[PDB]
Design a protein around this ligand. Structure first.
Ligand SMILES: Nc1ncnc2c1ncn2[C@@H]1O[C@H](COP(=O)(O)OP(=O)(O)OP(=O)(O)O)[C@@H](O)[C@H]1O
Ligand SMILES: [Mg+2]
Lengths: 97, 51, 40, 48, 99, 47, 378, 209
C-alpha cells in the first residue's frame, strides 16, 4: 500500500491477525458447534488438530458441512465421523490449487 | 453483436441486454423448430463467444 | 371497607389428593412384601 | 412540527396541507440494510 | 426369525378374521401349530393391542368384537375448556388488578 | 461499533449506495453529512 | 458455584426427613457446609440439627472470607470503571454474583443477575444467567419464578439452534414435570436420552436412565415399550449395567408378574427414600399395581380369582381386597364374582368414560367463571 | 376491495405442454452438481424438517454459472421436468418495460405468485441483463433498472425461512455483477460449471452417441 499512507503520523495503530493455532482452532469449533444437534462424545481437539491452521472460515466451512453428511444419511444427530469426513473434503479443497 | 464489455459507455448497457434477450431467445426453453437462422459478418472477431 | 363482624375471633394439592387416597395404609413397605413371601 | 424531509398528506384542489405522513426512512438505514453486514458480538469471537 | 414373526402373525390375522368366536383347538389345527404358544401369542396380540378381543381359560373361546369409538367430539371440546380457563386466568390480569 | 453503539457505516464504492449519498457525489466527502448526523460513528473499508 | 449445588439440597432432604438417618448427613453436609464459604442456607438446618454450640468462630472465619471476596469486588469496581471495558464491574460480578448466589442468598444473586442481564447484548451470557435463575428457582422451589424464566429462556433458543441450550434445558423441564406428577410430560422431556449428557446434576447418566425408564413405564403403552425402550441400543446397554431395573423392566414385558412385585417393593422403596420422588412414590405404585392388573385382566374374560395367587402374585384375599378397592375405586374395568369364585371382565365403550372428564372440566370452569363473575364488579 | 393475487408473466408454467422433456439420464457427467443441486432445491422442499430439526439453515437462493453450453439451461429443463412443486420460469430481460413501474410491479407480483401459489421454484436467466455493476442517474433507462434491482433486493430479504420459495439463477459471467446481490441472507450457494476434461467427457460421448 501507499507510503504516504505509511506516514508515521498518519496511521494510529496497525493490528496483525494471525491464522489460528490449535487452541484457536478449538474454540471456533466450540462456538460454531453450538447450534448443531450433536451426539454425545466428540473430542473436538482431534478435529482441531486435523486442520493445521487454515483460518477462522474453514472452521465454519467444515462444521456447517458436517450436517450434510448426517442429513444425507437422514440422521437427526450429528456424529463425529461426519467431521473427519468433512475435513477430508474441505482439506482436499485446501489441496486443490 | 459485440463480445461483452466491462461496462464502458451508457449505450452498450441496454444493447448487451438486447443481445442477451436474443441469446435466451435462440435456444432458451424452446423447441426451436422450422425456423432457421442465417447470419453474416465481415469480421468474426468482435463477437460474443456465447453467440 | 371490610368491617366484617367477627362472631368467633402447586406445592399442596397434588400432595392433598394423594393425601386423600394415600392416607392410612401400612406406610412402610420394605418388609410387608418380604413377609408375604413366606406366609403367602 | 413541520420537519424537513417529511411526507405529507395534501388536498388536491387547492393543495392545502392536510396531514403529516409519519416518516419514510433514514438515508443510512436504507442503504445500510441493502448492504446486510453480518452483525456480530464478543460471544462469537474465537480467541482474539 | 423376525420375518417369521411377521409371517406367523400374518397368518394369525388371516385365519382369525371371518368369525367372532372359536376354540383354540381349531385354530391350532388350522395354522397347524400348538396351543400354548398360540395362546400366549394371542395374549401378546391383546397385550400389544395390535389385535383386540378377549380370551378364555376354561376352553379358550376368543371373543372378537370391534367398533371405532367416537373420539373427536369430546376431547376437542375438552381442550378448549383448558384454553378458556387460562383465558379467565388472564382476566385476572386485566380485571382483578384494574378495577 | 455494535457494543459501544457506534454507527457502523462501511463503504463499498458501489453505485446502488450512490443514490442515497447524492445525485453524483463528486467527492466522497458528502458521506460526512450523514456521518456527523450519526456523529458517534465508525467508517469501515475493505481492501 | 451452582454446579454441585443440587446434591446439597438432596442431602438437606437426607438430613431432615429420614429421622433416624440423621448422623452421616449432618456429618457430610457439615463437611461441605463449614467450608466453601457457606453461611446462609443452614441456620434452620442447624435448628433441625443438634446444638453445634461453637459455630461462632466457624461463621466468623467464613463471613470474614466472604468479606474478602466482597471487599475485592470493592477493589474491582473502581479500576473497572476508570478504564471501562464491557462494564467490567458487572463483568466481575456477572461471574462472582453466582458466588453471591451460592454464598449469598437469592437477593444479591438475583438483582446482580437481572442487573447483568442488561449488559451482554448476546444470549450466550444471558441464557446461562437464566439457567442459574432456573437452578435457584428449583433450590428455593420457586415454582412461579421458574415459569417466568422458562419462557424467557425459551425466547432465546429460536435464534440459533443452541442444542446445548435446549437439550440441556429439556432436562430441567423433565425434572419439573417429574417434580409434579406430570409423567407423560416428564418422559416426553426425557425422550431423547442421547443428546442428554453425563450431567452435573445427574452425574450418573445411568441415574437419568433409571428416571426415564421409571417415568416411561407408566407414561407410554406397549406399542411404545415394545419398540422404543426395548430396541434402543442407547437404552439397552446402560441398563445392561443394571441387573435389577433390567429385570424390573422385563418382568412386565416378559409377563413375569410374580417376580414383578418382588422388584416392585425394592424399586418402590428406593423411590420412597429418593429425594423429589418422595412426594409421589405412592402415586407411582398405585398406578403400577392397577396397570399390571389391567394388563393381564384385559386378556381373559373367565379367569378365576384363585388363578392369580400362584401365578400372578400370592395372597387370594390380598387380590380380593386389592381388586375390590379398584373396581370400587372406579377403575379396573371388569366385574368380580365371589361365591362361584370367578372374575369376569367387561368392556366400557369410550362414550361414558370419555364423557366423565368432559363433565369434570365443565364443572371446573363453571366454578371458575362463577367465581370470577362474583369477584369482579364487586 | 381486496384481491386474490395476479401476475401476468409466465402464468405458472402450464405443466401440460410445458415440460422440456429432459431426463436426468439425458445429462451425463454431472454427478457432483446434479446431486448437489438436488440437495439444494427439492430436498429441503420435501425433507424440510431435517433442516428444521437439526437446524442447518437451508439455502435461500442459488446461483449457477460457467462457460456457455455447460448444461445451464438443460439442468433447469430436467429439474423443471421432474419437479413436484410449482415452477416459475422467467426470461430475465423482460423487466425493462417502456412504462415506468411495470418493472417493479412485474417484480413483486411474481414473488406474490410464488407466495400465493405454492412452496414454489423461481428460475431467472440472463441476470447480467439486470445486475450490472456501474450505474448512471442521467438516463432513466439506467434508473429504472436501478429500481428493478432494489425491488428484488428487498423481496429476497422479505422471507422468513417458512416458505419454500427457492430461487435458481443462471448466468454466464460472474464478473459483471454486484456482490451486494451475493450477500448471505440473499445468496449463499454458488455453482460454477467447469468443463469436463476426459472423465465425465466420455460419458457425454456415451449418451450422445
Ligand atoms: N450431458 C451433457 N452435458 C453437457 N452438455 C450437453 C450434454 N448433452 C448435451 N449437451 C449440449 O450442451 C448444451 C447445453 O445446453 P444449455 O442450453 O443448457 O447450454 P448452457 O450451458 O445453458 O449454455 P447457454 O447458456 O449458452 O445455452 C446443449 O445445447 C446440448 O446440445
Ligand atoms: Mg443456456
Amino acid at each position: 500500500l501507499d507510503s504516504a499512507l505509511l506516514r508515521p503520523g498518519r496511521i494510529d495503530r496497525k493490528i496483525e491477525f494471525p491464522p489460528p493455532n490449535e487452541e484457536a482452532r478449538l474454540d471456533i469449533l466450540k462456538i460454531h458447534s453450538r447450534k448443531m444437534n450433536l451426539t454425545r462424545g466428540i473430542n473436538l481437539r482431534k478435529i482441531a488438530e486435523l486442520m493445521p491452521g487454515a483460518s477462522g472460515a474453514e472452521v465454519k466451512g467444515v462444521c456447517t458441512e458436517a450436517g450434510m453428511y448426517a442429513l444425507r444419511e437422514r440422521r437427526v444427530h450429528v456424529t463425529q465421523e461426519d467431521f473427519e469426513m468433512a475435513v477430508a473434503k474441505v482439506m482436499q479443497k485446501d489441496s486443490e490449487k | 453483436g459485440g463480445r461483452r464489455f466491462s461496462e464502458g459507455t451508457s449505450a452498450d448497457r441496454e444493447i448487451q441486454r438486447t443481445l442477451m434477450e436474443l441469446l435466451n431467445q435462440m435456444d432458451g426453453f424452446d423447441t426451436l423448430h422450422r425456423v432457421k437462422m442465417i447470419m453474416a459478418t465481415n469480421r468474426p472477431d468482435t463477437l460474443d463467444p456465447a453467440l | 371497607m371490610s368491617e366484617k363482624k367477627q362472631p368467633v375471633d402447586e406445592d399442596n394439592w397434588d400432595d392433598d389428593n394423594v393425601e386423600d387416597d394415600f392416607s392410612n395404609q401400612l406406610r412402610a413397605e420394605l418388609e410387608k412384601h418380604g413377609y408375604k413371601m413366606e406366609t403367602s | 412540527d413541520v420537519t424537513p424531509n417529511c411526507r405529507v398528506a395534501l388536498r388536491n384542489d387547492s393543495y392545502t396541507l392536510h396531514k403529516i405522513l409519519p416518516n419514510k426512512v433514514d438515508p443510512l438505514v436504507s442503504l445500510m440494510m441493502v448492504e446486510k453486514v453480518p452483525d456480530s458480538t464478543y460471544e462469537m469471537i474465537g480467541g482474539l | 426369525a423376525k420375518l417369521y414373526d411377521n409371517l406367523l402373525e400374518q397368518n394369525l390375522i388371516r385365519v382369525i378374521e371371518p368369525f367372532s368366536r372359536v376354540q383354540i383347538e381349531h385354530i391350532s389345527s388350522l395354522i397347524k401349530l400348538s396351543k400354548a404358544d398360540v395362546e400366549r401369542k394371542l395374549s401378546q396380540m391383546i397385550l400389544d393391542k395390535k389385535f383386540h378381543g378377549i380370551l378364555d381359560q376354561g376352553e379358550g373361546v376368543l371373543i372378537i368384537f370391534d367398533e371405532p369409538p367416537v373420539d373427536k367430539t369430546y376431547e376437542a371440546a375438552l381442550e378448549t375448556i383448558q384454553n378458556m380457563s387460562k383465558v379467565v386466568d388472564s382476566l385476572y390480569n386485566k380485571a382483578k388488578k384494574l378495577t | 461499533a455494535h457494543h459501544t453503539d457506534c454507527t457502523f457505516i462501511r463503504v463499498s464504492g458501489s453505485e446502488l449506495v450512490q443514490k442515497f449519498i447524492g445525485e453524483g457525489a463528486r467527492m466522497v466527502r458528502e458521506l460526512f453529512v450523514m456521518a456527523r448526523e450519526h456523529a458517534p460513528s465508525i467508517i469501515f473499508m475493505d481492501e | 458455584p451452582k454446579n454441585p449445588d443440587l446434591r446439597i439440597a438432596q442431602l438437606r432432604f437426607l438430613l431432615s426427613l429420614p429421622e433416624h438417618r440423621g448422623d452421616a448427613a449432618v456429618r457430610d453436609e457439615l463437611m461441605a457446609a463449614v467450608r466453601d464459604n457457606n453461611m446462609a442456607p443452614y441456620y434452620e438446618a442447624l435448628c433441625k440439627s443438634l446444638d453445634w454450640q461453637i459455630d461462632v468462630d466457624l461463621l466468623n472465619k467464613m463471613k470474614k472470607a466472604n468479606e474478602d471476596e466482597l471487599k475485592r469486588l470493592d477493589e474491582e469496581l473502581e479500576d473497572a470503571e476508570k478504564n471501562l471495558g464491557e462494564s467490567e464491574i458487572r463483568d466481575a460480578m456477572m461471574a462472582k454474583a453466582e458466588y453471591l448466589c451460592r454464598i449469598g442468598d437469592k437477593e444479591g444473586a438475583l438483582t446482580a443477575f437481572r442487573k447483568t442481564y442488561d449488559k451482554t447484548v448476546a444470549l450466550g451470557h444471558r441464557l446461562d444467567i437464566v439457567f442459574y435463575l432456573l437452578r435457584i428457582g428449583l433450590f428455593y422451589m420457586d415454582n412461579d419464578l421458574i415459569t417466568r424464566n422458562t419462557e424467557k429462556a425459551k425466547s432465546l433458543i429460536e435464534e440459533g439452534g443452541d442444542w446445548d441450550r435446549r437439550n440441556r434445558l429439556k432436562v430441567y423441564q423433565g425434572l419439573y414435570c417429574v417434580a409434579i406428577r406430570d409423567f407423560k410430560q416428564a418422559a416426553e422431556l426425557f425422550l431423547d436420552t442421547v443428546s442428554t449428557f453425563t450431567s452435573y446434576e445427574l452425574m450418573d447418566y445411568k441415574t437419568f436412565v433409571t428416571y426415564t425408564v421409571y417415568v416411561s413405564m407408566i407414561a407410554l403403552e406397549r406399542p411404545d415399550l415394545r419398540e422404543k425402550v426395548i430396541k434402543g441400543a442407547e437404552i439397552l446397554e446402560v441398563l445392561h449395567s443394571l441387573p435389577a431395573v433390567r429385570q424390573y423392566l422385563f418382568s412386565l414385558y416378559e409377563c413375569r408378574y410374580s417376580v414383578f412385585f418382588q422388584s416392585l417393593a425394592v424399586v418402590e422403596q428406593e423411590m420412597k427414600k429418593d429425594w423429589l420422588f418422595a412426594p409421589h412414590y405412592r402415586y407411582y405404585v398405585r398406578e403400577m399395581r392397577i396397570h399390571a392388573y389391567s394388563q393381564l385382566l384385559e386378556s381373559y374374560r373367565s379367569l378365576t380369582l384363585g388363578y392369580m395367587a400362584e401365578a400372578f402374585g400370592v395372597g387370594v384375599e390380598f387380590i380380593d381386597q386389592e381388586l375390590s378397592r379398584f373396581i370400587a375405586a372406579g377403575r379396573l374395568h371388569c366385574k368380580i364374582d365371589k361365591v362361584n369364585e370367578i372374575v369376569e371382565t367387561n368392556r366400557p365403550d369410550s362414550k361414558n368414560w370419555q364423557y366423565q372428564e368432559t363433565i369434570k372440566k365443565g364443572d371446573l370452569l363453571l366454578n371458575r367463571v362463577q367465581k370470577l363473575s362474583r369477584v369482579i364488579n364487586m | 376491495d381486496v384481491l386474490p393475487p395476479e401476475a401476468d408473466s409466465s402464468i405458472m408454467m402450464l405443466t401440460s405442454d410445458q415440460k422440456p422433456d429432459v431426463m436426468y439420464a439425458d445429462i451425463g457427467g454431472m454427478d457432483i452438481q446434479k446431486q448437489e443441486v438436488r440437495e439444494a432445491v427439492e430436498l429441503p422442499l420435501t425433507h424440510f424438517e431435517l433442516y428444521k430439526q437439526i437446524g442447518i439453515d437451508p439455502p435461500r437462493g442459488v446461483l449457477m454459472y460457467g462457460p456457455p453450453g455447460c448444461g445451464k439451461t438443460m439442468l433447469a429443463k430436467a429439474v423443471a421436468h421432474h419437479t413436484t412443486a410449482a415452477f416459475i420460469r422467467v426470461v430475465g430481460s423482460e423487466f425493462v418495460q417502456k412504462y415506468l413501474g411495470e418493472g417493479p410491479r412485474m417484480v413483486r407480483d411474481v414473488f406474490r405468485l410464488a407466495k400465493e401459489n405454492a412452496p414454489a421454484i423461481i428460475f431467472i436467466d440472463e441476470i447480467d441483463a439486470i445486475a450490472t455493476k456501474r450505474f448512471d442517474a442521467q438516463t432513466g433507462a439506467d434508473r429504472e433498472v436501478q429500481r428493478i434491482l432494489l425491488e428484488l433486493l428487498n423481496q429476497m430479504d422479505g422471507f422468513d425461512q417458512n416458505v419454500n420459495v427457492k430461487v435458481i439463477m443462471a448466468t454466464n459471467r460472474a464478473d459483471t455483477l454486484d456482490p451486494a446481490l451475493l450477500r448471505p441472507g440473499r445468496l449463499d450457494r454458488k455453482i460454477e460449471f467447469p468443463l469436463p476434461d476426459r472423465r465425465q467427457k466420455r460419458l457425454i460421448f456415451s449418451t450422445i452417441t
